[PDB]
Amino acid sequence: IVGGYTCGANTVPYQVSLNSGYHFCGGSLINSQWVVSAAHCYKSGIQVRLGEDNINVVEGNEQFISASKSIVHPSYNSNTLNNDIMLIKLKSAASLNSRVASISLPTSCASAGTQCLISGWGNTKSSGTSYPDVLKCLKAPILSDSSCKSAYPGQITSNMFCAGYLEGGKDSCQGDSGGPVVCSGKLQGIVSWGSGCAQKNKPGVYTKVCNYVSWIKQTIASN
Ligand SMILES: [Ca+2]
Asked: Is 98 noted as a catalytic residue in this protein?
């Protein structure tokens, strides 16, 4: 997250870290057994880390649970990032509590102009590199489809939305991929892609979770 703020320990209790020996992507807990992330975050060997604030210090509220199964969307295209969504099943159910909590899936799709909360442990620099240990947060508005398409001609599908600031300075970034975009208390987006981070005229692009609620619900009813 570039241009964000320190969230505050466990104030984003649905945020997970995906770990393969190191943090490599975010995700969102949607019930005690399942995480939603980006398909481009797929790796074998994932441990889900819940209740994290500093990902380099064991602070006392964490639950570390191995994934049993990952399910990349059936129509995921890694070239375009169309359908950039994945489900991860945990080997055992998380214990839900004040610091480890699920986020609601949407009923309706979010509205252009709505301010959403994006979070993660990704890079905090637009130019260069610096990875935080504690979770960072950013409030960012959803941009109109027309503005999104104009920023990324020939690249935006109806399964994507842009959010952020066209002047630059504030965005998600590498290492935030797979994490939540929460708008009116529901998971509306997944950190997916963008050209650089926090550059002018190059807002973040996010998987449009409202398009996937029927796939999510039938998949979790079946696995
Ligand atoms: Ca920790």
From this structure: no
